[PDB]
């Protein structure tokens, strides 16, 4: 499977799709989220009646924040990947002011919203989601991609209750070490905080944080200020809730391992150390991939998304930052 997937990915990676729609082809309905250099809107493609999520990036804001290369990485990778638990990019294009990525709409909202409301997920519920992340990272890492943005805010729940990973803004295709300080404080591996060259093992550490947060209802390292979070991470002293199973604690001690020669996902057996762990004994990896497992939770409707202030989309009469985004 992975061999065929790499062939498919490389053809798209080497020859990326460009300019596959236009802003006038979509009716903009409502804002689903906002970020430093734009917003995500629910849109309707008038030709088909399909709903999509449109990520709008202001070129000038990307340039001001020195995020050009990361924005080019995001679109180049997202247009090339194909996996059941990844958001599907349908179109991309740009105009004088903005870049646009149009993705299949995932109506269930963020895992973040459901997790905070419910409090915590039971171990079988958390295991169901964690299995999907394990398979997704096995897929991404096999293509030499590092994701670097795992958190419940970036995991969307589809109509079948399965996950769709979004936000490839920090994704990068890299064969060696990399050094960028990026991610979310609670999810940073110690080697990122300590300004070391790091690798895909940072995604496995982030999975450890995610599983802990899903099962506990709070992350393993938190504090009001990021500097305080970093001190807790680099110490790596993790305390587990009394309701955590012995198998769950063993798995987390292996993922939330400061020692790279000991961290699960980063050993000679790679992902198999995770797949074969006792916590995952009840997991049928193939049925998860095939979406045959009954989901523990089933969510143009935007009710599973928070409300955001609307703003008119202004397109300048002059092209901005043309050379910087020529390949988009």
């Amino acid at each position: 499977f992975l061999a065929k997937a790499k062939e498919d990915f490389l053809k798209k990676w080497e020859n990326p799709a460009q300019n596959t729609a236009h802003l006038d082809q979509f009716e903009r309905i409502k804002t689903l989220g906002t970020g430093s250099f734009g917003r995500v809107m629910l849109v309707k493609h008038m030709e088909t009646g399909n709903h999509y999520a449109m990520k709008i990036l202001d070129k000038q804001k990307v340039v001001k924040l020195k995020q050009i290369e990361h924005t080019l990485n995001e679109k180049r990778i997202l247009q090339a990947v194909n996996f059941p638990f990844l958001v599907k990019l349908e179109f991309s294009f740009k105009d004088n002011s903005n870049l646009y990525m149009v993705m299949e709409y995932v109506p269930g909202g963020e895992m973040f919203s459901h997790l905070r409301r419910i409090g915590r997920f039971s171990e079988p519920h958390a295991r169901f989601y964690a299995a999907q992340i394990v398979l997704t990272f096995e897929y991404l890492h096999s293509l030499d991609l590092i994701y670097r943005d795992l958190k419940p805010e970036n995991l969307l729940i589809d109509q079948q209750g399965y996950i769709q990973v979004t936000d490839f803004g920090f994704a990068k295709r890299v064969k060696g070490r990399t050094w960028t300080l990026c991610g979310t404080p609670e999810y940073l591996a110690p080697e990122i905080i300590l300004s070391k060259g790091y690798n895909k093992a940072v995604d496995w550490w982030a999975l450890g944080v995610l599983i802990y947060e899903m099962a506990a209802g709070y992350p393993p390292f938190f504090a009001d200020q990021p500097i305080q979070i970093y001190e807790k991470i680099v110490s790596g002293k993790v305390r587990f809730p009394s309701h955590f199973s012995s198998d769950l604690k063993d798995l987390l001690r292996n993922l939330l391992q400061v020692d790279l020669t000991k961290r699960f996902g980063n050993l000679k057996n790679g992902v198999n150390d995770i797949k074969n762990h006792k916590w995952f004994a009840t997991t049928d990896w193939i049925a998860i991939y095939q979406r045959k497992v009954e989901a523990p939770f089933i969510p143009g409707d935007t009710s599973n998304f928070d409300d955001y202030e609307e703003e008119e989309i202004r397109v300048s009469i002059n092209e901005k930052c043309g050379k910087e985004f020529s390949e988009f």
Binding site: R116, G183, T184, P185, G217, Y218, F222
Partner: peptide
């Protein structure tokens, strides 16, 4: 409790990237 400490913290909302 750790849960009460989390809920009273300023980090329960959507977390921004660094």
């Amino acid at each position: 409790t750790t849960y009460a400490d989390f809920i009273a913290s300023g980090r329960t909302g959507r977390r921004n990237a660094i």
